[PDB]
Design a protein around this ligand. Structure first.
Ligand SMILES: Cc1cc2nc3c(=O)[nH]c(=O)nc-3n(C[C@H](O)[C@H](O)[C@H](O)COP(=O)(O)OP(=O)(O)OC[C@H]3O[C@@H](n4cnc5c(N)ncnc54)[C@H](O)[C@@H]3O)c2cc1C
Ligand SMILES: NC(=O)c1ccc[n+]([C@@H]2O[C@H](COP(=O)([O-])OP(=O)(O)OC[C@H]3O[C@@H](n4cnc5c(N)ncnc54)[C@H](O)[C@@H]3O)[C@@H](O)[C@H]2O)c1
Ligand SMILES: [Mg+2]
Lengths: 1216, 107, 54
């Protein structure tokens, strides 16, 4: 058996001094990076004056010769939406291949009116891109109804001539401006004109981010075929005068990442070598484009091997991009220059600023990392660029610098820095096709600056170019971009020729972070400190984590029944790694049912002492526990990895979530809890195995900080991490009497639930177990004669709907993550993928290809994507489901499992194609994705089918179309919605998490209503109010007044105001995402009244919170509701058979204690969802206006919208 | 329609144009249920007309109109209320219902 | 444009014929000007050959 973590993440090669200096700078504070860059970029006053004069001359030429879309908009008086809609129509018309066919459709059908009748795919799928073209602004989703109206309007107003002009404009833009040509041969033919003037070319075949092996092979053969065409055309011109090719490593392997470095070196490297050998034979340049920050250092390992490979010797065409917006740039250049010296290869180094800025900001924030790997002020990148150019210009004997920029100030600074001595081959400039030529026609040629420029020339079809045109447009179209600013008449030439070096040097604090960009730790500002993650692409982190993980596997982890009196004896057994039963992780001593009952009594005895600790001090314990968990994260990772089958990434997220729960509930406590919010008493916290630290910690922390002593019953599969969490909480100051750990199975949980002193139960687990707990508690009443509160957060049957406007690569990534991360052992996991029929085959092919790139195995290796299932019984249950589906004829795709999995319990990621959603019965908690197809017109029926399961936990929608977003999100009934992203988000306080129906009672964990359930009188949560009044409530209040029920009418009006129905908030979070939190009606509330006044109060509470009601007909109170307004009658039904008239979403009960008990038993017996029941006596209704709490009569919905999904971040376009 | 508003001119021609900004991303939910019912009974042309009405309806439009500082001038499209339907044929009734439901009305 | 240039004369007539104060006569003429320009612009945004008159 391999030693734990002995092969966790070994680097490709030992890290040299130069490589280590790169890694050291990865997230270096910006104030530390800038001073050496300012020093390196400094030039003489004479040079700065000459550079400013050259820059001004270039800018005056640019503005003096400075429209196609603008002229079209002007000629036809188009609004912006009309312009966008016209270009979308033109794009669609250009998908018609035969020119005569297209013209006939235009003249005879489109112009005549009904454009919709003639053109399974919205015309407006790419409208965000055309919006950027037309308006210069990026809108992440498309208002397709506005565009449809605009297109009808413009066609009916202007007819065929405007369509003709739009088609011709789109044809020119998509065939000649955004690309040099559709094919390499076309691009080569069009390159002769500027080559004759002194330009050169580097062709970009537009491949990027292979998702499958077949994609990577396709991009490979495209590069190979392009190299032949380019090399034939080069015809011996060599690497400087002649054309070259640019490649992206991510196009050549579907798992191009540090986590898969061994596969990258084994499988990607030979492909690059083969292309490089061909480039060598033709003697053309082959440039490796730079991509995301977490791929930089990995790419250096490929560059190193290639430059040292003797088969490539004699050729100096290998090129490599370095991004000056990155903090490692100068150190990367030092490494490359040294590699060029060692290898004797004159590496072609393209210095760029960088293309992924918005995405790097978002990713660092999401990952909770120490800092960004890029600068946050645009001027810093400019100084970095000039400093790095100074380094390159001192090394022209060993590298060939290529200065890619459209910024005339940057250009002029380097032109003068390089000096008067020049020859072709010393250095060159570079620019983008169809963007940089106006500037560089003022540079190239003896009559200008007599410096060469290489044009980066995209080559591809309309489909290929539109895929990432958004990112390419933002490079020169954001408010901080030179190309945007040159076209802004409000920006003077003096502003454009400003020297970034001298401006940064004169700043009060050199290199300060942008004021408007939060470091990841500061996402929540003063509310709390964000948890910190770990960068698994950082070699220092991987090396330190390797040692910490190994050390964690040498620890003697135990879990004991930790009673208030001390550890208790019991039955002891080992805890085995689910991925390899030979790896003993620790030992658990399980709690006897007698000791569980004793623990509850001890908790009851200790309840007053813990309630007396002021809320601020209880919250301080939680905050101290968060600090301790943060410091201990690496050790906690190792335990979670080995005990629960988690990968390192998922263990990091698990620990971060625990930290976030602690800090969030601490802050919510500081915002709310006072002397009148008395604790319930001893709370039994029963937690699931699959989030064995986060959910465990969340429930306990909430109960404790609300003033309740806790009996913590962790899942029998994962007691060790729970014991460690309890140890940390106790170290943080939680007294032993307030927090008792009771390891064991469901018997221990049940014994705790049944104990007479148990005052509340927090359960997260399966719906079937929650139903057993619900039945246990229906026998019980508090000493005050009221139901024991139960939070029961249960299973999901989570769907994602994907329409034909979604980007398949994005969908597949989010599906692979949502369905198979943690082997599908997340309650939020994607279970049913619903694909619009027109795109289903393409997406399914891509999905299956991506599935086969996953590595399944024991999770103590960074290269493992999917770990084991928790037990052999879980495995048997999942496999029984798979074989049942397979036996029904359903198509089943499964990864082949390695032989090494035999020592653990693994189920391969599985895709099952279903006919109907009704084919599924219950949640299958494993790596099993079901796929259904739907016709677009059946979307509403499909949403009904999703709702019809009775679950309501997570739900995803992938679409670019606002109409579809509005429709689907208005009709789906789930607690956590996700738009254009994965569906596993549960970021505490950002996506408060929890569902409805069979998925939960609520309130949501990680949300603001949670703590209020754990006290006898709920506080008012932060931000919890609504200015909206339910109109049916208002009608009922008027009806009550008309009936003479004046006091009840007043109570109804008060309920209408007190209700927070309609609350609609945006929660602070990372850039590039909008996280929304709203309060809706729960649905149909069962009312069990005893008196007319009680019924009126129950109805007021339910109506004020937007609900309908079913009133117990056995109450005999029918005559109390005569002559209701029709609006109220629509919400009111009477029920003689409660089980027939559900599912309900809650209940309100009036009666004495024994009536409440009887009703509670009858309610628990209803099929389906657990009901959040509130009960009150008639006297309580009379005395307490809050007898029924409105908090529990609304339903919380969280929605997380990826606003960067179109390819960029609009809000960050204004952050420079 | 209102004088000084974008629907006015469309009343004075035999085929109304699509006014500037006149659209809505919202689809009446009762319209949606009606379309599903129509498809259930095989009324394919009527279900298609219902879906088209649901999309082209501007019910729920909610705009701020340009004006002076220190004022917010809002313009919104709501249901008319209850529409009297006087059909002659089953298909005519389905089309009338589609138009009325898509615009939020009762009938 | 003509109503704008002739507003002072139009005001005098409105004041004496319709009992309006000067401020309200100004508002009256402004509103007529705005209707003219608004319906002109709405026409330029919408009307094409298939929108036949009544
Ligand atoms: C021929 C060519 C090839 C290229 N190849 C690549 C490549 O392989 N990989 C790659 O990543 N890029 C590449 N780029 C660069 C990228 O695509 C952009 O074109 C470039 O970053 C824009 O810089 P600019 O000097 O032309 O414009 P400028 O307007 O001078 O600079 C804009 C740049 O500033 C940076 N920036 C903007 N805001 C901020 C901020 N708030 N904080 C810090 N920095 C900020 C960004 O890098 C942005 O692109 C290439 C560019 C060219 C011309
Ligand atoms: N809604 C959420 O937020 C959420 C979160 C995570 C997991 N889940 C659900 O949890 C389930 C997986 O976790 P699990 O396998 O540990 O669930 P489970 O239902 O098997 O066990 C959950 C807990 O209940 C205990 N238990 C079992 N029988 C009991 C009984 N008769 N009385 C009292 N306690 C009893 C177990 O010991 C364990 O601690 C999945 O269904 C998943 O969807 C829901
Ligand atoms: Mg279980």
């Amino acid at each position: 058996a391999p030693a734990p973590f002995a092969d966790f993440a070994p680097p490709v090669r030992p890290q040299s001094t130069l490589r280590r200096a790169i890694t050291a700078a990865y997230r270096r504070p910006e104030t530390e990076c800038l001073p050496p860059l300012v020093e390196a970029a400094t030039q003489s006053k004479e040079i700065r004056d000459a550079a400013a004069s050259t820059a001004r001359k270039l800018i005056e030429a640019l503005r003096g010769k400075h429209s196609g879309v603008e002229g079209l908009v002007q000629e036809y008086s188009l609004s912006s939406q009309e312009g966008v809609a016209l270009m979308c129509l033109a794009e669609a018309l250009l998908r018609i291949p035969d020119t005569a066919t297209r013209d006939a459709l235009i003249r005879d059908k489109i112009a005549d009116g009904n454009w919709k009748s003639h053109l399974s795919r919205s015309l407006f799928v790419n409208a965000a891109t055309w919006g950027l073209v037309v308006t210069g602004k990026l809108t992440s989703t498309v208002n397709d109804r506005s565009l449809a109206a605009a297109l009808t309007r413009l066609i009916s107003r202007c007819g065929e001539p405007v369509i003709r002009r739009g088609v011709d404009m789109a044809m020119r833009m998509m065939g000649e401006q955004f690309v040099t040509g559709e094919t390499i041969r076309e691009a080569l033919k069009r390159s002769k004109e500027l080559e004759e003037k002194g330009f050169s070319y580097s062709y970009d075949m537009l491949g990027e981010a292979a998702t499958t092996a077949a994609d990577a092979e396709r991009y490979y053969r495209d590069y190979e075929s392009a190299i032949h065409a380019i090399g034939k055309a080069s015809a011996g011109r060599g690497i400087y005068e002649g054309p070259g090719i640019s490649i992206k490593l991510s196009a050549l392997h579907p798992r191009y990442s540090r986590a898969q470095a061994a596969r990258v070196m084994g499988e990607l490297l030979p492909r690059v070598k083969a292309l490089a050998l061909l480039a060598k034979n033709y003697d053309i340049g082959l440039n490796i484009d730079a991509e995301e920050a977490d791929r930089l250092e990995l790419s250096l390992d490929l560059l190193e091997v290639l430059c040292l490979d003797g088969d490539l010797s004699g050729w100096n065409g290998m090129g490599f991009v370095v991004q000056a917006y990155g903090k490692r740039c100068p150190f990367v250049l030092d490494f490359i220059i040294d590699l060029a010296r060692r290898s004797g290869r004159r590496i072609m180094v393209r210095l760029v600023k960088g293309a992924y800025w918005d995405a790097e900001i978002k990713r660092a924030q999401l990952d909770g990392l120490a800092d960004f790997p890029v600068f946050t002020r645009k001027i810093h990148t400019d100084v970095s660029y000039i400093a790095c150019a100074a380094k390159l210009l001192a090394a022209t004997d060993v590298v060939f610098p290529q200065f890619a920029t459209h910024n005339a100030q940057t250009l002029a600074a380097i032109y003068h820095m390089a000096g008067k001595d020049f020859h072709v081959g010393k250095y060159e400039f570079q620019c983008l096709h169809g963007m940089g030529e106006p500037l560089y026609e003022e540079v190239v040629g003896r009559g200008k600056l007599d410096r060469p420029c290489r044009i980066y020339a995209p080559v591809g079809t309309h489909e290929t170019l539109l895929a990432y045109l958004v990112r390419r447009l933002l490079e020169n179209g954001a408010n901080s971009s030179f190309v945007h600013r040159i076209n802004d008449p409000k920006v003077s030439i003096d502003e454009l020729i400003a020297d970034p070096v001298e401006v940064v040097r004169a700043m009060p604090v050199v290199g300060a972070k942008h004021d408007r960009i939060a470091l990841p730790a500061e996402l929540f500002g003063d509310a709390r400190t964000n948890s910190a993650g770990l960068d698994l692409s950082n070699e220092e982190t991987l090396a330190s984590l390797t040692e910490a993980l190994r050390e964690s596997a040498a620890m003697k982890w135990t879990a004991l029944p930790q009673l208030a009196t001390g550890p208790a004896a019991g039955e002891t057994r080992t805890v085995l790694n689910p991925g390899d039963h030979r790896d003993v992780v620790g030992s658990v001593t399980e709690t006897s049912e007698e000791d569980a009952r004793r623990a509850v009594r001890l908790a009851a005895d200790a309840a007053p002492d813990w309630a007396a600790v002021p809320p601020s001090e209880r919250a301080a314990c939680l905050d101290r526990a968060a600090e301790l968990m943060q410091a201990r994260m690496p050790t906690l990772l190792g335990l979670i990895i080995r005990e629960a089958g988690k990968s390192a990434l998922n263990a990091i997220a698990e620990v971060r979530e625990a930290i976030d729960f602690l800090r969030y509930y601490a802050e919510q406590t500081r915002r709310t809890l006072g002397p009148g919010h008395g604790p319930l008493g001893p709370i039994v916290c029963i937690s699931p195995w699959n989030f064995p630290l986060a959910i465990f910690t969340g429930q306990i922390a909430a109960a404790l900080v609300a003033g309740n002593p806790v009996l913590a019953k962790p899942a029998e599969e994962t007691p060790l991490i729970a014991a460690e969490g309890v140890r940390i909480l106790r170290e943080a100051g939680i007294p032993a009497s307030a927090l008792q750990l009771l390891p064991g199975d469901g018997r221990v949980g049940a014994a705790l639930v049944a104990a007479a002193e148990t005052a509340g139960v927090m359960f997260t687990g399966s719906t079937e177990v929650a139903r057993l707990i619900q039945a246990q508690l229906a026998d019980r009443l508090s000493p005050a004669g009221r139901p024991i509160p139960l939070i029961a957060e249960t299973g999901g049957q989570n769907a994602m709907i994907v329409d034909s406007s979604a980007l398949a690569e994005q969908v597949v990534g989010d599906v692979i993550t949502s369905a198979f991360d943690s082997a599908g052992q997340r309650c939020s996991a994607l279970r049913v993928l619903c694909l619009q029929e027109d795109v289903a085959d393409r997406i399914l092919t891509m999905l299956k290809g991506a599935l086969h790139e996953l590595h399944i195995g024991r999770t103590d290796r960074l290269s493992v994507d999917v770990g084991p299932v928790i037990t052999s019984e879980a495995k048997d249950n999942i496999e029984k489901h798979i074989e049942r589906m397979r036996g029904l004829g359903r198509k089943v795709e499964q990864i082949g499992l390695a032989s090494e999995t035999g020592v653990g319990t693994f189920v391969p990621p599985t895709i099952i194609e279903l006919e109907k959603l009704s084919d599924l019965q219950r949640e299958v908690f494993g790596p099993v994705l079901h796929v259904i197809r739907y016709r677009r017109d059946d979307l509403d029926r499909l949403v009904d089918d999703v709702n019809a399961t009775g679950y309501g936990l997570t739900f995803g929608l992938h679409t670019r179309l606002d109409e579809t977003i509005a429709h689907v999100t208005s009709r789906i009934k789930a607690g956590n919605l996700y738009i254009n992203r994965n569906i596993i988000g549960a970021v505490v306080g950002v996506q408060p998490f929890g569902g409805r129906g069979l998925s939960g009672t609520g309130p949501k964990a990680g949300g603001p209503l949670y703590l209020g359930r754990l006290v006898t009188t709920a506080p008012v949560p932060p931000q919890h109010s609504s200015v909206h009044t339910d109109p049916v409530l208002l009608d009922f209040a008027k009806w009550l007044d008309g009936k003479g029920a004046r006091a009840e009418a007043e109570a109804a009006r008060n309920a209408g105001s007190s209700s927070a129905l309609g609350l609609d908030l945006e929660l602070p979070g990372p850039v590039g995402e909008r996280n929304l939190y709203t309060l809706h009606a729960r649905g149909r509330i069962l009312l069990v009244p005893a008196t007319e006044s009680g019924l009126y109060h129950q109805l007021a509470a339910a109506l004020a919170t937007g609900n309908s009601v079913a009133i117990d007909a056995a109450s005999g109170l029918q005559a109390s509701l005569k002559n209701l307004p029709q609006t109220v009658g629509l919400r009111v039904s009477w029920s003689k058979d409660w089980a027939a008239d559900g599912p309900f979403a809650g209940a309100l009960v009036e009666g004495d204690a024994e009536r409440i008990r009887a009703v509670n038993k009858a309610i628990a017996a209803l099929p389906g969802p657990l009901l959040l029941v509130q009960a009150a006596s008639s006297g309580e209704i009379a005395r307490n206006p809050d007898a029924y709490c409105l908090n529990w009569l609304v339903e919380e919905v969280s929605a997380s919208i990826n606003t960067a999904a179109a390819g960029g971040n609009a809000s960050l376009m204004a952050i420079g």
